[PDB]
Design a protein around this ligand. Structure first.
Ligand SMILES: Nc1ncnc2c1ncn2[C@@H]1O[C@H](COP(=O)(O)OP(=O)(O)O)[C@@H](O)[C@H]1O
Ligand SMILES: CC(C)[C@]12C[C@](O)(c3ccccc3CN1)N(C1CC1)C2=O
Ligand SMILES: [Mg+2]
Ligand SMILES: [Mg+2]
Length: 260
């Protein structure tokens, strides 16, 4: 159906490991969108065909305002093209670099939107497994949108930076929905502080800090945020709260600008 000739390509939006993402306009409708370009040789050498199929399959059937739409795909002799919803306000990653850290209200609002999207996913027993700032995008009204479903699967299951991964996943053990709850805790901390809680200089040390759950709070982190973050970052996945508990947490309801 679709081919390259149906699109006018514009400025580069961002780069990933495989993805090279461009602004584009569909010629006949003038529909503005983002084109994620992937190199077949690279996908082949890495052997990640199965991940790309999951990305296309999962994300094209999901329908939630806080989840980035994927409309379709095509391919030519050297490349694959994913047709995505364009997110005009950029990444949460960029916004964090701009401001250093977020206040409590901005943080709590992002966490609610995230918890809302993750709740929809887990209801279908879909787990994302790669929640982090560069994969969280912003809409025209500044609303958060989860993207990059390359690592997602159907729980239960086995299998760059370790910073967002829970102990059971890094230790090669088995995992479920609770992995996304650990990542949610890591994100809440990084939003308020400016860096992720287990960050270190080497892969080897980061691994040690994650598996031992070694993190501390700066003085300016309030009691409420401390309580929520400490509940999310439990070694034992079953001890981690449910998304409903997160959305009803006193610190969240006191500071968030959006509902569940
Ligand atoms: N729909 C989009 N709108 C705006 N920017 C995007 C969009 N998709 C991706 N980007 C930018 O391109 C980067 C890489 O995209 P991503 O799909 O995460 O690739 P990868 O799977 O290689 O990580 C993102 O971090 C973001 O900066
Ligand atoms: C025609 C065929 C060879 C294929 C199928 C493929 O696995 C795939 C997977 C998800 C989405 C699109 C496509 C494109 N067509 N693949 C990419 C190299 C991974 C191809 O080149
Ligand atoms: Mg990505
Ligand atoms: Mg990916």
């Amino acid at each position: 159906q679709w081919a390259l000739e149906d699109f006018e390509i514009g400025r580069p939006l961002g780069k990933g490991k495989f993805g090279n993402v461009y602004l584009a306009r569909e010629k006949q409708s003038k529909f503005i969108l983002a084109l994620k370009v992937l190199f077949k040789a690279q996908l082949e050498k890495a052997g990640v065909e199965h991940q790309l199929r999951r990305e296309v399959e999962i994300q094209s059937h999901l329908r939630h305002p806080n989840i980035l739409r994927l409309y379709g795909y095509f391919h030519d002799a050297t490349r694959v093209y994913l047709i995505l919803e364009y997110a005009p306000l950029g990444t949460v990653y960029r916004e964090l670099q701009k401001l250093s850290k977020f206040d409590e209200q901005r943080t709590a609002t992002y966490i609610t939107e995230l918890a809302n999207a993750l709740s929809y996913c887990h209801s279908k027993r879909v787990i994302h497994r790669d929640i982090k700032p560069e994969n969280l995008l912003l809409g025209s009204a500044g609303e958060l949108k989860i993207a990059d479903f390359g690592w997602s699967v159907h729980a239960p299951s086995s299998r760059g930076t370790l910073d967002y991964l829970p102990p059971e996943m890094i230790e090669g053990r088995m995992h479920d929905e609770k992995v996304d709850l650990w990542s949610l805790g890591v994100l809440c901390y990084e939003f308020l502080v400016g860096k992720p809680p287990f960050e270190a200089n080497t892969y080897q040390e980061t691994y040690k800090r994650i598996s031992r759950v070694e993190f501390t709070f700066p003085d300016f982190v309030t009691e409420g945020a401390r309580d929520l973050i400490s509940r999310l970052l439990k070694h034992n996945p079953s001890q981690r709260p449910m998304l409903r508990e997160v959305l009803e947490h006193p610190w969240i309801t006191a500071n968030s600008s959006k509902p569940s």
